[PDB]
Ligand binder design. Structure first.
Ligand SMILES: O=P(O)(O)C(O)(Cc1cccnc1)P(=O)(O)O
Ligand SMILES: O=P(O)(O)C(O)(Cc1cccnc1)P(=O)(O)O
Ligand SMILES: C=C(C)CCOP(=O)(O)OP(=O)(O)O
Ligand SMILES: C=C(C)CCOP(=O)(O)OP(=O)(O)O
Ligand SMILES: [Mg+2]
Ligand SMILES: [Mg+2]
Ligand SMILES: [Mg+2]
Ligand SMILES: [Mg+2]
Ligand SMILES: [Mg+2]
Ligand SMILES: [Mg+2]
Lengths: 344, 344
């Protein structure tokens, strides 16, 4: 797996080179292009590259090796990097809105001295780079428009998910009544499940020439369920994770977020425990945040998570057995293995 | 002209209706859709609608009236509203980054209590709505991909212009040496000239089936020059404009912006006057901002602007005479008339 990763990261230098080549033809925007490189180098590198690697691995498993030529394989890891750019755009913006401190083992881009809210445009430039690369490498391809629409839809989906997340998590207002299982499943479906799990497999499918409605609908049933689990896992790691491993500091309690943990807490809270949560949740005070963590540990939520993860993996495996065909089960199995029991 | 405007604004209620119809099929995202309507109602309404109206007026002048059917005309004002959505996205984001107080006669969306930096996602949703409308009304059209790429390119262009603007205007740092005419022309070309003047005429050209490289290149020569003047006019109105008319408070001096006014000031400043500008520019202090305004008025920059506007209009008119053909000169003349001597 570490060999798959290294080949993918080795292509980033050319991705930057092609995206910052504009300085030759237009020396006037030289500084802007130099800032884009700085934004690319900081915000697209450091992660696990699960989405980008999924595009590359799913492409090799869906396309016949006699068809996988040098150009065809370059297009596959360029689209992989396009998904990594979509990730970069989403995270730079989300770290501002969530008032987060760290990302991928370093300070958040907006928290850097000399950046600040300029990071909003930087996030937008990262998004702009997807369509630049799609045009430079896939314009003459039959799946060109299908990939453009798939990335556009992925953006709208996450942004609607982001609207739901932000409306359920108001700063200064107690929203315990909206923290339900039905609300949670609606948020994470749009917010994470589509771009993190459906988008990479669907992009590799369109590139393989699998554009069928039924085929895409079947992959979606598995992948949207995989995405729900991945977000539940991220919600657990925000509180019970190790920041040296995760590369980020948790803010869900301070930010009044509709975390899977608070949904589970409210399902098992006594009237007394509900007031402890009402009085201490969604506030900046360290002592208040510590009080909520103590209640989660008291309701044995880390073990509730361990049981969920076991039942969830068995459900996703049952979904692979039901809907994988005619695609190789390894397509969905490889991604499932890379996220199950994850600590990063 | 006021009759052209009223018909265009009357179509906004249907634009909202089609974009917020998702609540029927998906009641789970109801609140998110309700927030999108609130974002659309606040941020896409209030302006002069020059870009949206340009798409509609240029379409009727380029397409034969026997071909202008009910569906064909609906597609024209939908693409007009798509340009107004691109404007909304840019302004919501720019008002955060510029730390502006008002927009279109009301408080900035991000300055609204309960909104704040959530406005970043709201800006992104406005951008998402362009491609939603392009898909719902122009997917079966021969110019579909051409319009998608034209809006994508318009975004990258403005965002690169925005990178240049923000890098030349650092908070806390004296950047008088970079405030040159060559730097100014580079910023506003990418930042404003492409999306505000080229994008509306080019979209109406593609819809009329005029996709020729030479035809688009010729319109670009006129329109990019028109855009340079429009930004110069906006830079003048930031200081010498009336906020009841403009609907916005100026921040260029406080924000250390490479304004056309500071470029002209530095070209006419004595060594003594240069130090007055160096000591008082780019700071929040009201007295410091007032000192810079006094120097501009002392160098007679409002009259320097009046002479520029006269020479600029004659240059753009000469460009219409050179490059309008085979397009009707009214296409470029109508837009020129709507921005020349502007106070809004
Ligand atoms: O990495 P983070 O900040 O923990 C997160 O997962 C980031 C994110 C951004 C956009 C879409 N989905 C997740 P969040 O939702 O704020 O918990
Ligand atoms: O409306 P504003 O804020 O005066 C402006 O024109 C807004 C704007 C946003 C995006 C592109 N071009 C202009 P700016 O450049 O900040 O002076
Ligand atoms: C969808 C959510 C959970 C955001 C972060 O995802 P990752 O955990 O995949 O972050 P990176 O690997 O890209 O750094
Ligand atoms: C390109 C710049 C100068 C931003 C504002 O343009 P407008 O003056 O056209 O603003 P609205 O009419 O859309 O409100
Ligand atoms: Mg976050
Ligand atoms: Mg978030
Ligand atoms: Mg999280
Ligand atoms: Mg501004
Ligand atoms: Mg600005
Ligand atoms: Mg201005």
């Amino acid at each position: 797996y570490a060999q798959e990763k290294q080949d993918f990261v080795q292509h980033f230098s050319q991705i930057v080179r092609v995206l910052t080549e504009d300085e030759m033809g237009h020396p006037e925007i030289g500084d802007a292009i130099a800032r884009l490189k700085e934004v690319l180098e900081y915000n697209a590198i450091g992660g696990k590259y699960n989405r980008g690697l999924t595009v590359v691995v799913a492409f090799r498993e869906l396309v016949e090796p006699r068809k996988q030529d040098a150009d065809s394989l370059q297009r596959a890891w360029t689209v992989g990097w396009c998904v990594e750019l979509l990730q970069a755009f989403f995270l730079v913006a989300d770290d501002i809105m969530d008032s987060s401190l760290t990302r991928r083992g370093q300070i958040c881009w907006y928290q850097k001295p000399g950046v600040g809210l300029d990071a909003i445009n930087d996030a937008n430039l990262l998004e702009a780079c997807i369509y630049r690369l799609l045009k430079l490498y896939c314009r003459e391809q039959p799946y060109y428009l299908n990939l453009i629409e798939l990335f556009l839809q992925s953006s709208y989906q996450t942004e609607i998910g982001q609207t739901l997340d932000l409306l359920t998590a108001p700063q200064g207002n107690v929203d315990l009544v909206r923290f339900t299982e039905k609300r949670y499943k609606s948020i994470v479906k749009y917010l994470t499940a589509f771009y993190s799990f459906y988008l990479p497999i669907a992009a590799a499918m369109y590139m393989a020439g699998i554009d069928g409605e039924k085929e895409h609908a079947n992959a979606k049933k598995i992948l949207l369920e995989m995405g729900e689990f991945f977000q539940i896992q991220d919600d657990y790691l925000d509180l019970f994770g190790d920041p040296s491993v995760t590369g980020k500091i948790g803010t869900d309690i301070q930010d009044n977020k509709c975390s899977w943990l608070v949904v589970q807490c409210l399902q098992r809270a006594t009237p007394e425990q509900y007031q402890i949560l009402k009085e201490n949740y969604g506030q900046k005070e360290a002592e208040k945040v510590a009080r909520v963590k103590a209640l989660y540990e008291e309701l044995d939520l880390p073990a509730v998570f361990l049981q969920y993860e076991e039942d969830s993996y068995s459900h996703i495996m049952a979904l692979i057995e039901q809907y994988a065909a005619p695609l190789p089960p390894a397509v969905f199995l490889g991604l499932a293995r890379k996220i199950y029991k994850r600590r990063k």
